[PDB]
């Protein structure tokens, strides 16, 4: 509907709602493979279901942008893609495990 | 008060003068040696002594905020004059 | 993760000349308190400094010349062990001076007025 | 708030299209630039006739250095080495001893003018207004050594520029 | 009013503390410590091999969009076993915030190159290598950036002399610039400025 | 400036502006190079009483950073570094160039 | 104590990388002499490469060897890309420094150096 | 047996008869001082070391007050800070403006403790006191306008050097330190009064005006003039 997003290289999407729903569903699908007690899984599932609920309840793009407070709808789509990629990488990394190694006895001391 | 060394070289107010056998005098050949003719010690000796009827006087060097930090000189020793050592100024109590 | 049964030595990596690696003896020590002041806040960390080299007089302007790169180099360490480890891994010789702390002293203001002892003062 | 530097579209009416086509075929903006340059040609130049005319300066200007004296002729410097301590580039070398009359006076006061950054810190830290930065700036030399001032050279600078230095310090001393 | 004392921002302090707890909970495997300085700056200390996961999380996470790499440098502390301290400064434009991530390394331990997270890391890590000697594993082009060609040693190290070991001049015999050992007409006069009286009791360390 | 009337007309016509209104050369419109002496204010800490440095010491109020989490040592809502930055408003003064 | 290897695992692979870098430098000296118009011989350049390799022959840490070969590759690619000038290439040879004395009597005569 | 005292709430076991200053020294806190020297007797006159005990309405001289069981020493409390500021205010009210022409310069306890524990401004709108200078030999130069009447030189002279020719003459603000007669304090231990004097009243005469503390490089060696090996 709008001519440009105002940002160089960011094209306008004619179907924001469907793309956002697809991306959020894929993110939720990836998070199901993460352990239930993982702190990463709970927070991003919470925020994704919060944002997925907003897109399923507001059909107007301008009001959806106002409600999401994430910039423009194309920026929201790009952020959803980044979150999906991060979820996949964290699934590969598994950073919910206990600390790899405590530092030496005096490593963050200051002044020294 | 400039003074001349035995080699004909002017002596500065710090007493500096190259020795006769010193090779470093070659830098002045076909040129000159920078010596300031005014001697602060001689000028401040030329300055007189101020007589004030007080045991303690104050000196700020003249000019107020344009001088030196204000100091107090105790004029009790009658065998000498009290000298403000910021500006080398002598003060004395009236004798006789 | 490889296992190396070798001592740490980075002399070939630091880029220091061989002369200033081999012929240098650093001094690991805690600086003595400046006798002109009663503060002791400069006697808390260990210091590493090099041996004094020659200083001569500039023919022009009479300034103090030097040919020693490490004349002004002083390093600060929190521990004698840390300083020794740094010196060992950098390959310089080192001389270690044990820290000197003042011994505890028994003070009493009432000793200035002793009835039979020499601690009685003649003035206040 | 924000504004768009370039987000306007041109009107596609026939008159505006013809105007743009006339601008393209008849180089209107190029003629406009020519007119601007012609106007500047017929304006008066902003060039001063140096060395017979000098650019304006202020009492705060930091130029060549000078060692000052008291009105009695005594040197103001008391060998306190505050300027040497505060010098960023370490351009000042000072050596002192008691004088014949016991005064605390310097024997060596060197400033390397090829090392100095002319930052004015030495005259700020001086408690007796001894070291100052004079108004002189035309003191270029032909050899490097001539820019390595010593105490005699600085005292000669002070004696040479004392009147102007005193006037500038009088003008600007209430802001310090 | 206290006109000469900097005012504090408890709101921003609490927000930064909450977000530090958030990231520490999300990444327990790497995050070692979280601090908030009293002038409202969040600082995260992580394990050296968590650099890529932590930076990728802080860049791509929806609740942490630190899309900009403000700076990347290192600090040399010879008294530590791991003398080099790598510092990343990130800026989040979406939430108008800044964060700092600190890791540690020594001479012989590489640090993963973050050119796949931020493209500025290329030149920032080149400078870190050139000035401290820290090697970055997967770097597209790792070489000197600021020092002269063939320069030996890493000058920002605390043990490197201020004037270095060599100096340059033009030699007329060989018709080229030559490098010779450094020799100063005036030696840099070292000053001892520290006062022997403690200034800040709040930072006093235990005698141990 | 000192110029002929015809030359001023030519300059104004060529540039399209009245140049005499905005001249780039200074003609006695600048401040005098000699000024009366000033008297600068003192400050807020120049009191003679109820002015102790311990109550106005900024450096001594600095503290080591608070250790929020240290490894050595309900459903929480997800948090952000700060509230999301609000959308900027278009300029009322001149929205477009 | 197990440590993260930069490369080469044990010492054999570090020696292999040293040999690879030595071959790369050995095959480059004629090109360096040709491009930089050096007045030295190709044999002189190869001898200098050998000498610079031999002063690190006492290293027994594979990670130090890996860092040394990394820096050798860096200074080789500076020579190949002609980023260096004849100035640096001849800085390798110390053609202008006076020969420092090495015996006790001469060192005693000249100055106070150890 | 050791008694338990508290410095800023931190427990520390100290021997009976230990002072507040020594307890703070044990916990690593150096209380400011001008007259206290650990090698000399306790004078307690400069009043710079006043600290607050937790329940005591009155500040105590930390250099002369033995600690009691269960004493909490508030070293950085408001009362202690105000006491230090007041004492420094009196000291600098009567002190002269001689810092640039003074050899003590950057190694002065008055300057450092004024920068660390005193105020940054002066309320003294009167004239200052100027004191005649004495002559006690060719080694120690005396500018007694800078003296703060801390009696470190007197105590050192008497107790350490066994020479009782230093003391205070007069009383009040006109109290002066000297011999009261033209006598040279000649002894083999005369420079230590130069060392222990916190101000520039006693300075080295051969070293006068030659250098400043920040310039000098310190080389830690031993002494060869005798067989003590100082
Ligand atoms: C072809 C043009 C011939 C006439 C001409 O040059 O008129 C200049 C004269 C310059 O006018 P202006 O720029 O207003 O004068 C500057 C001020 O009046 C300030 O002018 P000024 O008071 O400095 O005048 C100094 C005087 C004397 O100046 C000189 O003698 C120096 C220049 C010598 C040049 C040879 O200048 C002249 O006499 C100018 C004419 C020189 C002709 C040669 O132009 C006119 O009178 C109008 C010309 C319109 C042309 C279309
Ligand atoms: S102007 Fe600055 S750099 Fe120059 S001598 Fe003064 S303090 Fe030093
Ligand atoms: S600051 Fe002034 S009085 Fe002090 S040494 Fe420098 S020129 Fe001399
Ligand atoms: S004794 Fe200390 S405070 Fe007094 S003039 Fe000397 S340096 Fe300044
Ligand atoms: S001369 Fe010095 S040591 Fe003696 S009482 Fe005065 S300040 Fe103390
Ligand atoms: S140090 Fe205690 S009163 Fe002087
Ligand atoms: Mg003294
Ligand atoms: Zn005076």
**Per-residue 3-state assignment (H helix, E strand, C coil) for E138-173:** CCCCCCCCCCCCCCCCCCCCCCCCCCCCEEEEEECC
Q: How close, in Å, is residue D76 to chain F by CA atoms?
A: 25
Q: Do H101 and B85 make contact, defined as CB atoms within 8 angstroms?
A: yes
Q: Do F58 and E16 make contact, defined as CB atoms within 8 angstroms?
A: no
Name residue F6's beta-bridge partners: none
Tell whether D90 is within 8 A of chain E (Cβ): yes
Cα D132 to ligand 4 centre (Å): 25
Q: Which two tokens stand for residue H138?
A: 């060719």
Closest CA to E100 of E53, E22, E37, E12: E37
- Omega before D51 within 30 of 0, i.e. cis: yes
Give the closest ligand to the alpha carbon of residue D122: 2
Residue with tokens 């001049």: E169
CATH 2.60.260.40 at B40-92, yes or no? yes
Segment holding A16, helix H or strand E: helix A16-31
β-pair type (E84-92, E97-105):
antiparallel
Q: Which of H34, H102, H149, H214 to mutate to test the pocket of ligand 4 (most atoms within 8 A of CB)?
A: H102
Tell whether C78 is within 8 A of chain A (Cβ): yes
Question: Considering only CA atoms, which residue is closest to atom 7 of ligand 3?
Answer: D131
* Helices A16-31 & A61-68 angle (0-180, nearest 10): 40
Is it the case that chain H and chain B have 3 or more CB pairs lying under 8 Å apart? Answer: yes
User: Is residue D96 within 8 Å of residue D104, measured between CB atoms?
Assistant: yes
Q: How close, in Å, is residue H149 to chain C by CA atoms?
A: 11
Cα separation, D11 vs H213, whole angstroms: 79
Which of E106-110's residues contact partners 24+ apart within 8 Å by CB, and which partners? E106/E81, E106/E82, E107/C10, E107/C13, E107/E83, E107/E133, E108/C8, E108/C10, E108/G3, E108/G6, E108/G61, E108/G63, E108/G64, E108/G67, E109/E48, E109/E82, E109/G3, E109/G4, E110/E134, E110/E135, E110/E136, E110/E137, E110/G4, E110/G6
Q: Which two tokens stand for residue D4?
A: 């768009």
Cα separation, G108 vs G110, whole angstroms: 6
Tell whether A103 is within 8 A of chain E (Cβ): yes
Q: Which two tokens stand for residue G66?
A: 């890996």
Q: Is the dihedral of CA G57, G62, G63, G68 positive or negative?
A: positive
Cα separation, G11 vs G17, whole angstroms: 10
F6 lines ligand 1 (CB under 6 A): yes
Q: Do E56 and A83 make contact, defined as CB atoms within 8 angstroms?
A: no
Ligand 4 neighbours (beta carbon < 6 A)? H 95, 98-99, 102, 104-105, 108, 110-111, 146, 199-200
C-alpha distances out from residue H42 to H27, H158, H175, Å: 21, 14, 20
Give the closest ligand to the alpha carbon of residue C34: 7
**What number of CA atoms fall less than 13 Å from residue D90's CA on the CB side?**
8
F7 lines ligand 1 (CB under 6 A): yes
Q: Which two tokens stand for residue E191?
A: 């000053």
Q: What is the dihedral of CA F60, F65, F68, F69, to 10 degrees?
A: -140
Residue positions counted in chain E: 208
User: Is residue E42 within 8 Å of residue E19, measured between CB atoms?
Assistant: yes
Reduce the DSSP state of residue A2 to 3 states and report it.
coil
β-pair type (H140-142, E41-46):
unpaired
Residue with tokens 């190396």: C4
Contacts of D73 (CB under 8 A, 6+ apart): B38, B40, B42, B43, B44, B46, B47
Cα separation, A64 vs A58, whole angstroms: 6
Q: Which residues of C touch H219 (CB under 8 A)?
A: 52
Cα separation, C74 vs H5, whole angstroms: 39
Q: Which residues of E touch H116 (CB under 8 A)?
A: 195, 197-199
Q: How is G45-100 classified by DSSP, letter by letter? A: HHHHHHHHHHTTTT---HHHHHHHHHHHHHHHHHHHTT-S-HHHHHHTTT-SS---
Report phi then psi at E14, rounded to 5: -65, -40
Q: How close, in Å, is residue H196 to chain B by CA atoms?
A: 25
- Using only C-alpha atoms, chain B has a radius of gyration, in whole angstroms, of 20
Cα separation, B24 vs B12, whole angstroms: 16
Segment holding G106, helix H or strand E: helix G104-110
Nearest chain B residue to D149 by CA distance is B34
Cα separation, D110 vs D118, whole angstroms: 15
Segment holding A22, helix H or strand E: helix A16-31
Q: In the complex, which subunits touch B with 3 or more CB pairs below 8 angstroms?
A: D, H
C-alpha distances out from residue F95 to A6, A7, D2, D8, F90, Å: 14, 17, 7, 11, 6
Cα H154 to ligand 4 centre (Å): 20
CATH 3.40.50.300 at D64-175, yes or no? no
The minimal CB distance from H85 to the residues F46, F48, F52 is found for: F52
Q: Do C3 and G1 make contact, defined as CB atoms within 8 angstroms?
A: yes
F2 lines ligand 1 (CB under 6 A): yes
End-to-end CA distance of chain A, in Å? Answer: 60
Q: Do F97 and D8 make contact, defined as CB atoms within 8 angstroms?
A: yes
Q: Do F54 and H120 make contact, defined as CB atoms within 8 angstroms?
A: no
**Across chain E, which distance is largest between two alpha carbons, in Å?**
72
- Ligand 6: nearest atom to the Cα of H36: 1
Cα separation, H74 vs H62, whole angstroms: 11
β-pair type (E31-37, D148-149):
unpaired
Residue H90 labeled ligand binder: no
User: Is residue H152 within 8 Å of residue C123, measured between CB atoms?
Assistant: no
Cα separation, E197 vs C40, whole angstroms: 7
Q: Which two tokens stand for residue F2?
A: 């000192």
Contacts of F79 (CB under 8 A, 6+ apart): E15, E18, E19, E21, E22, E63
Report phi then psi at F92, rounded to 5: -80, -25
* Helices H78-94 & H109-117 angle (0-180, nearest 10): 140
C-alpha distances out from residue F45 to D93, D96, H112, H114, H118, Å: 37, 38, 22, 17, 15
Name residue H10's beta-bridge partners: H7
- Dihedral-angle region of residue C105 (phi above 0 means left; psi in -120 to 50 means alpha; beta otherwise): beta
Cα separation, H188 vs H202, whole angstroms: 16
Q: Which residues of E touch H216 (CB under 8 A)?
A: 192
Closest CA to E70 of E120, E4, E28: E120
Question: Considering only CA atoms, which residue is closest to atom 1 of ligand 6?
Answer: H33
Q: Which residues of E touch F71 (CB under 8 A)?
A: 31-33
Q: What's the angle, vertex CA G32, arms to CA G28 and CA G34, rounded to 5?
A: 120
Q: How is chain E classified by DSSP, letter by letter? A: --TTS----HHHHHHHHHHHHHHHHH-TTTEEEEEEETTTEEEEEE-GGGHHHHHHHHHHBTTB---EEEEEEEEE-TTSSS-EEEEEEEEETTTTEEEEEEEEE-TT--B---TTT-TTHHHHHHHHHHHH---BTT-SS---SSSPTT--S-TTSTTS-TT-SEEEEEETTTTEEEEEE--BSS---------SS-S-GGGPPP--
Contacts of E208 (CB under 8 A, 6+ apart): none
Tell whether E191 is within 8 A of chain C (Cβ): no
Q: Which two tokens stand for residue E93?
A: 């434009």
Q: Which residues of D touch C57 (CB under 8 A)?
A: none
Report phi then psi at C56, rounded to 5: -120, -175
- Using only C-alpha atoms, chain C has a radius of gyration, in whole angstroms, of 23
Q: Which of H107, H199, H202, H204 to mutate to test the pocket of ligand 4 (most atoms within 8 A of CB)?
A: H199
Contacts of F35 (CB under 8 A, 6+ apart): none
Q: Which of F3, F4, F6, F14 to mutate to test the pocket of ligand 1 (most atoms within 8 A of CB)?
A: F4
Cα separation, H144 vs D105, whole angstroms: 21
The minimal CB distance from C14 to the residues E153, E163, E190 is found for: E153
Q: Do D46 and F90 make contact, defined as CB atoms within 8 angstroms?
A: no
Q: Do E150 and G85 make contact, defined as CB atoms within 8 angstroms?
A: no
β-pair type (E97-105, E41-46):
parallel
Q: Do D73 and B40 make contact, defined as CB atoms within 8 angstroms?
A: yes
CB atoms < 10 A from the CB of E96, how many?
13
Q: Which two tokens stand for residue H135?
A: 């002559």
Residue with tokens 């106070």: G112
Cα separation, H73 vs H51, whole angstroms: 7
Q: How is F24-79 classified by DSSP, letter by letter? A: SS--S-SPPSS---------TT--SSS--GGGS-SGGG--PPEEEEES----PPP-
Segment holding B51, helix H or strand E: strand B50-51
Ligand 2 neighbours (beta carbon < 6 A)? D 86-89, 91-92, 111, 116-122
Q: Pick out the residues of the known binding site of D for [4Fe-4S] cluster.
A: 77, 80, 83, 87, 116, 119, 122, 126
Quick one: resolution in A? 2.9
Closest CA to G51 of G70, G29, G67: G29
Q: Do E108 and G3 make contact, defined as CB atoms within 8 angstroms?
A: yes
Give the closest ligand to the alpha carbon of residue H33: 6
Q: Which residues of C touch A101 (CB under 8 A)?
A: none
């Amino acid at each position: 509907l709008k001519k440009t997003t105002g940002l160089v290289g960011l094209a306008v999407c004619e179907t924001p709602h469907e793309r956002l729903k697809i991306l959020y569903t894929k993110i939720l699908d990836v998070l199901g493979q993460i352990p239930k007690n993982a702190a990463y899984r709970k927070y991003t599932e919470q925020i994704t279901n919060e944002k997925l609920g907003m897109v399923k309840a507001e059909p107007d793009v301008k009001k959806l942008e106002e409600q999401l407070q994430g910039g423009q709808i194309e920026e929201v789509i790009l952020q959803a893609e980044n979150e999906l990629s991060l979820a996949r990488k964290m699934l590969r990394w598994k950073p919910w495990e206990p600390l790899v190694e405590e530092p030496p006895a005096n490593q963050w001391k200051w002044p020294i | 008060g400039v003074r001349t060394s035995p080699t004909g070289e002017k002596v500065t107010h710090t007493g500096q003068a190259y020795d006769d056998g010193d090779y470093r005098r070659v830098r002045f050949s076909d040129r000159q040696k920078e010596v300031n003719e005014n001697f602060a010690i001689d000028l401040i000796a030329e300055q007189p002594v101020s007589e004030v009827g007080s045991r303690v006087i104050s000196c700020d060097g003249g000019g107020g905020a344009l001088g030196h930090p204000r100091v107090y000189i105790n004029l009790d020793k009658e065998t000498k004059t009290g000298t403000c050592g910021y500006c080398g100024l002598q003060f004395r109590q009236p004798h006789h | 993760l490889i296992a190396v049964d070798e001592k740490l030595d980075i002399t070939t990596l630091t880029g220091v000349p061989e002369e200033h690696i081999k012929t240098r003896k650093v001094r690991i020590f805690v600086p003595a308190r400046n006798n002109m002041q009663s503060g002791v806040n400069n006697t808390k960390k260990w210091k590493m400094e090099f041996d004094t080299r020659e200083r001569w007089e500039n023919p022009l302007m009479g300034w103090s010349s030097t040919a020693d790169p490490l004349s002004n180099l002083v390093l600060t360490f929190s521990t004698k062990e840390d300083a020794v480890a740094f010196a060992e891994k950098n390959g310089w010789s080192f001389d270690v001076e044990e820290r000197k702390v003042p011994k505890p002293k028994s003070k009493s203001y009432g000793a200035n007025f002793s009835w039979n002892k020499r601690t009685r003062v003649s003035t206040k | 708030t924000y504004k768009f530097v370039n987000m306007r579209e041109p009107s596609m009416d026939m008159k505006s299209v013809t105007d743009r086509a006339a601008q393209t075929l008849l180089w209107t903006e190029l003629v406009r630039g020519l007119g601007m340059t012609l106007s500047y040609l017929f304006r008066e130049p902003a060039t001063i006739n140096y060395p017979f005319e000098k650019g304006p300066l202020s009492p705060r200007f930091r130029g060549e250095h000078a060692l000052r004296r008291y009105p009695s002729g005594e040197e103001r410097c008391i060998a306190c080495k505050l300027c040497e301590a505060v010098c960023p580039a370490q351009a000042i070398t000072i050596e002192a001893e008691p004088r014949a009359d016991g005064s605390r006076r310097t024997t060596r006061y060197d400033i390397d003018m090829t090392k100095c950054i002319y930052c004015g810190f030495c005259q700020e830290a001086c408690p007796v207004d001894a070291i100052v930065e004079g108004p002189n700036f035309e003191f270029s030399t032909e050899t490097h050594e001539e820019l390595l001032y010593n105490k005699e050279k600085l005292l000669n600078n002070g004696d040479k520029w004392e009147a102007e230095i005193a006037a500038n310090i009088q003008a600007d001393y209430l802001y310090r | 009013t206290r006109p000469t004392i900097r005012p504090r921002n408890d709101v921003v302090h609490k927000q930064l503390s909450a977000f530090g707890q958030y990231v520490a909970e999300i990444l327990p495997k790497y995050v070692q410590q979280v601090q908030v300085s009293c002038f409202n700056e969040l600082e995260i200390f992580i394990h050296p091999d968590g650099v890529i996961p932590v930076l990728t999380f802080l860049r791509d996470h929806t609740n942490a969009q630190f899309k900009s790499l403000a700076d990347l440098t290192a600090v040399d502390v010879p008294t530590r076993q791991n003398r080099f301290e790598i510092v990343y400064n990130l800026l989040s434009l979406r939430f108008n915030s800044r964060i700092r991530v600190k890791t540690y390394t020594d001479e012989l331990t590489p640090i993963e190159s973050s050119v796949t997270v931020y493209k500025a890391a290329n030149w920032y890590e080149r400078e870190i290598w050139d000035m401290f000697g820290v090697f970055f594993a997967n770097h597209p082009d790792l070489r000197r950036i600021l020092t002269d060609y063939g320069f030996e040693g890493h000058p920002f190290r605390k043990d490197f002399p201020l004037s270095g070991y060599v100096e340059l001049r033009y030699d007329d015999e060989v018709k080229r610039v030559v490098a010779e050992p450094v020799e100063l007409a005036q030696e840099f006069r070292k000053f001892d400025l520290n006062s022997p009286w403690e200034a800040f009791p709040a930072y006093r360390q235990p005698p141990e | 400036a000192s110029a002929t009337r015809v030359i001023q007309l030519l300059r104004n016509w060529a540039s399209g502006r009245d140049l005499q209104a905005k001249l780039q050369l200074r003609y006695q419109e600048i401040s005098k190079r000699t000024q009366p002496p000033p008297k600068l204010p003192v400050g807020p800490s120049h009191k003679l009483s109820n002015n102790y440095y311990c109550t106005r010491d900024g450096r001594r109020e600095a503290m080591p950073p608070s250790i929020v989490m240290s490894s050595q040592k309900t459903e929480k809502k997800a948090v952000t570094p700060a509230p999301p930055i609000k959308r900027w408003e278009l300029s009322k003064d001149q929205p477009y160039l | 104590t197990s440590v993260k290897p930069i490369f080469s695992r044990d010492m054999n692979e570090a020696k292999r990388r040293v040999r690879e870098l030595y071959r790369a430098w050995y095959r480059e000296v004629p090109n360096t002499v040709h491009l930089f118009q050096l007045d030295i011989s190709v044999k002189q350049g190869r001898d200098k490469v050998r000498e610079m390799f031999m002063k690190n022959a006492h290293v027994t840490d594979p990670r130090v060897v890996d860092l040394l070969v990394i820096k050798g590759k860096m200074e080789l690619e500076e020579t190949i890309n002609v980023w260096k000038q004849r100035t640096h290439i001849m800085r390798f040879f110390h053609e202008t420094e006076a020969p420092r004395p090495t015996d006790f009597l001469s060192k005693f005569y000249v100055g106070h150096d150890p | 047996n050791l008694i338990e005292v508290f410095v800023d709430g931190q427990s520390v076991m100290v021997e009976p008869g230990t002072t507040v200053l020594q307890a703070c020294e044990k916990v690593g806190m150096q209380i400011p001082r001008f007259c206290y020297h650990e090698r000399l007797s306790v004078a307690g006159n400069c009043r710079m070391c006043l600290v607050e005990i937790e329940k005591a309405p009155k500040v105590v001289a930390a250099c002369a007050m033995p600690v009691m069981k269960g004493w909490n020493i508030l070293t950085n409390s408001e009362k202690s800070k105000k006491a230090r500021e007041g004492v420094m205010e009196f000291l600098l009210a009567n002190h002269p403006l001689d810092c640039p022409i003074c050899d003590q310069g950057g190694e002065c306890d008055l300057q450092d403790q004024s920068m660390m524990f005193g105020s940054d401004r002066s309320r003294f709108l009167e004239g200052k006191r100027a004191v005649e200078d004495k002559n006690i030999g060719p080694l120690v130069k005396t500018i007694m306008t800078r003296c703060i009447q801390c009696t470190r030189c007197i105590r050192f002279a008497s107790e350490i050097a066994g020479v009782d020719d230093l003391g205070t003459t007069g009383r009040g603000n006109d109290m002066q330190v000297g011999t009261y007669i033209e006598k040279m304090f000649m002894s083999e231990l005369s420079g230590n009064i130069i060392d222990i004097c916190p101000v520039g009243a006693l300075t080295s005469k051969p070293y006068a005006f030659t250098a400043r503390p920040w310039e000098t490089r310190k080389t830690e060696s031993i002494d060869v003039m005798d067989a003590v090996g100082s």
